[PDB]
């Protein structure tokens, strides 16, 4: 009815169809901690929410004020649930509460409660239909929005709402190539489809990032997704890779490229490759190259990688102490 | 600024 | 030399680690441009203004901004009425870190506030009358064990607290935040935490768990939130710790988060992002950071032969760097970013990173490394529990004299 913005606001005190309940005051102590000076309009919205909480009044107006009191903190989650049990015994239409939960996270999307809410809501309806487009707005907003790419997971993997989601992938990762957010899903959508061991599809995928480290070769995103899609199998597993990568090596250099290449020696030398000491010596070259030169930043990590592949791949490592 | 609950 | 600088950040090569966006822009390489530019500022600042770099931790203005908070707070703080536990949690930690002794007034009076906080169920709420939440209730038990007085102890009702964690207990491993609420990796830190310190801890409390957790580690070699969600520092933490509580790091990948943590840390900044192609924050720099010490106890544990024995896995300089000369608001507190304003969230961690990134320790071996002053040295900090080391073991002992509830 009345708006917490409103110019015309009233505070619940000053209400007439309030006037019987007797508001009840923050039990804070005799001498309090963290004691948080609340404007007059938030204490007097919540001494009033703990009365109703207190009778457990499940009324209509007690359903209005949960709006004013999550308004001024949408945090509160003891607010959502007293407001979802008003909603079961109201009895009140839920798609009414969907739209008022899609305003709500339109204003703050960076809540836990509201998209909890939100998803309790699709839960009692059974009802995806709204979700995709609506987490597409959100996302219109903030391409990143962590909350939003859980819900859009959960409504997918839980409805089997697959059939659109690369294709929604494609978009955004054309938008903006390197977000991290977008390449997670987009190893959240073929993994629960068609899997990344069918090797057409796997083909696909590495060519697809190479060809995109290839426009944008510092880009993170594209070196750790190639990296995630590839190093179950074993790196050393694909050949051609390891060439492929050298000849970017000039023209498309980073310290993405050089930290891959000593990934792929790694585990060459775990599958013990040939010219066990050629790789070796490749490996601690590049590995004090990112340590000194191209990524310092990481010198602490790149020593011990270093160190741990000297410690068990070097000609010395599998000959015993009186040799 | 964050959020952790 | 005497051309040469002793502050990383402000090297001469340190400008190659500027970002390269290949001449293509989207909107991360603007918003990450933007960013540096503003960082970059501030590093040259004694530059441009001829003056010799000093790096001093505002510890008297911290000091008032922390003792003011923790007993009262604007309505700026109105967001958090539902998360005061937290309050007393990141000020009483920052006040520790700080070397600030806790006055019994004060303990008392957070005593007497917490209780109100608990729940007749169990757990502890985020304010008085308000239904019990993990995330409160985590806070709550550390704020207690700061203080470590046995009326601190004696507020945590243990036998209700374990029947509250059970109340929460999923099929598949996970918790739920709250009755009713939401599922995420947060949960199963916060449990773990706040079982193992009080000592209530079941034989199948835990059942399954370590799975769930296992299961949020991704392509990135991070941990997300949930299965199937993108690698974040705050979630790797949760999962990373709670692991470490069980025991079970071994269900994960080591070898993948370790790349991709110490991959968060960034080149030009100094500090660490939450996930990778975001931006740098102050708050990381435990979130982040913090795994290291995890993932050292965790490969010594072991037997890893290659780990250092004088620093962690990350560039604890750097880091240091960026939270003296970029997270300190001049008025006391600290914060995510120049731009951004101070909050005792940031006050905490920003604190929590730096001792980290001052104290190496594994067993014996002990190196600290302290940028600026030497005033500048903070109290350790327990990487699983983010309190004092010594709260912890003096916790754990206390309630070791207890009986795991129900026996
Ligand atoms: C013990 C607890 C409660 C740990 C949680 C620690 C954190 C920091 C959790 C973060 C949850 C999260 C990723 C929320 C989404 O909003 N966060 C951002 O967008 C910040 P960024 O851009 O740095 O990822
Ligand atoms: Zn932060």
Not at chain 1, 194 to 198: I, M
Not at chain 1, 235 to 240: D, G, T, V
């Given at each position: 009815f009345l708006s917490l913005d409103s110019p015309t606001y009233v505070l619940y005190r000053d209400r007439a169809e309030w006037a019987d309940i007797d508001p009840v005051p923050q039990n804070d102590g005799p001498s309090p901690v963290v004691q948080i000076i609340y404007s007059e309009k938030f204490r007097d919205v919540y001494d009033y929410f703990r009365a109703v909480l207190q009778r457990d009044e499940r009324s209509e107006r007690a359903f209005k004020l949960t709006r004013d009191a999550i308004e001024l903190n949408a945090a509160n989650y003891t607010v959502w649930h007293f407001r979802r049990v008003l909603l079961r015994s109201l009895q009140k239409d839920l798609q009414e509460e969907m739209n008022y939960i899609i305003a709500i996270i339109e204003e703050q999307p960076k809540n836990y409660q509201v998209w909890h809410h939100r998803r309790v809501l699709v839960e009692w309806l059974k009802d995806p239909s709204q979700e995709l487009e609506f987490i597409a707005d959100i996302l219109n907003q903030d391409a990143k929005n962590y909350h939003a790419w859980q819900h859009r997971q959960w409504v997918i993997q839980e409805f089997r709402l697959w059939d659109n989601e690369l294709q929604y992938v494609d978009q955004l990762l054309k938008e903006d190539v390197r977000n991290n957010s977008v390449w997670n899903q987009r190893h959240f959508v073929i993994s629960n489809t068609?899997?990344?061991?069918?090797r057409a599809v796997l083909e696909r995928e590495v060519q697809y990032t190479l060809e995109m480290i290839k426009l944008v070769p510092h880009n993170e995103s594209a070196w750790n997704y190639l990296k995630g899609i590839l190093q179950d199998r074993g790196?050393?597993?694909?050949?051609?890779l390891l060439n492929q990568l050298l000849d970017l090596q000039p023209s498309h250099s980073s310290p993405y490229l050089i930290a891959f290449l000593v990934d792929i020696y790694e585990d060459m030398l775990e599958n013990q490759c040939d010219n066990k000491e050629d790789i070796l010596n490749k490996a601690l070259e590049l590995c004090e190259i990112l340590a000194k030169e191209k990524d310092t930043i990481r010198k602490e990590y790149w020593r011990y990688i270093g160190r741990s592949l000297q410690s068990k791949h070097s000609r010395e490592s599998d000959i015993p102490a009186s040799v | 600024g964050c959020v952790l609950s | 030399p005497v051309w040469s600088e002793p502050l990383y950040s402000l090297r001469p090569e340190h400008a190659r680690e500027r970002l390269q966006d290949d001449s293509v822009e989207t909107v991360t390489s603007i918003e990450q441009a933007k960013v540096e530019e503003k960082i970059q500022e501030v590093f040259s600042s004694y530059k441009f203004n001829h003056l010799v770099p000093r790096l001093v931790l505002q510890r008297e203005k911290h000091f008032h901004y922390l003792k003011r908070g923790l007993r009262q707070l604007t309505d700026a703080y109105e967001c958090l009425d539902a998360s005061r536990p937290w309050l007393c949690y990141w000020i009483l930690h920052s006040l520790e870190l700080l070397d600030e002794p806790i006055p019994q007034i004060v303990a008392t009076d957070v005593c007497q506030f917490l209780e109100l906080c608990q729940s007749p169920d169990g757990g502890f709420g985020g304010g008085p009358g308000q239904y019990p939440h993990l995330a409160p209730t985590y806070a709550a038990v550390n704020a207690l064990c700061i203080i470590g007085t046995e009326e601190a102890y004696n507020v945590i009702n243990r036998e209700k607290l374990l029947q509250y964690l059970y109340s929460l207990?999923?099929?598949?491993?996970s918790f739920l935040m709250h009755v009713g609420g939401e599922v995420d990796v947060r949960s199963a830190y916060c449990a773990a935490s706040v079982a193992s310190l009080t000592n209530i801890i079941t034989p199948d409390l835990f059942e399954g768990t370590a799975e769930w957790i296992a299961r949020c580690q991704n392509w990135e070699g991070g941990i997300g939130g949930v299965p199937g969600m993108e690698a974040h520092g705050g979630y790797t933490f949760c999962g990373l710790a709670a692991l470490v509580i069980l025991k079970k790091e071994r269900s994960l990948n080591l070898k993948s988060l370790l790349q991709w943590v110490t991959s968060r840390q960034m080149r030009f900044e100094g500090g660490f992002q939450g996930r990778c192609n975001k931006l740098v924050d102050g708050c990381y720099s435990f979130w982040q950071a913090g795994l290291l010490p995890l993932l050292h106890r965790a490969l010594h544990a072991q037997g890893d032969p290659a780990l250092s024995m004088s620093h962690w896995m990350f560039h604890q300089q750097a880091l240091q760097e960026y939270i003296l000369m970029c997270c300190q608001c001049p008025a006391g507190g600290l914060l995510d970013k120049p731009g951004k304003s101070r909050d005792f969230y940031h006050t905490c961690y920003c604190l929590s990173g730096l001792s980290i990134a001052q104290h190496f320790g594994s067993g014996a071996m002990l190196h600290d490394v302290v940028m600026g002053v030497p005033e500048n040295v903070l109290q350790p900090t327990h990487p699983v529990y983010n309190i004092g080391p010594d709260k912890v073991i003096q916790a754990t002992t206390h309630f070791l004299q207890k009986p795991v509830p129900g026996f």
């Open positions: 068609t899997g990344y061991s069918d790196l050393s597993r694909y050949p051609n | - | 207990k999923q099929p598949d491993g």
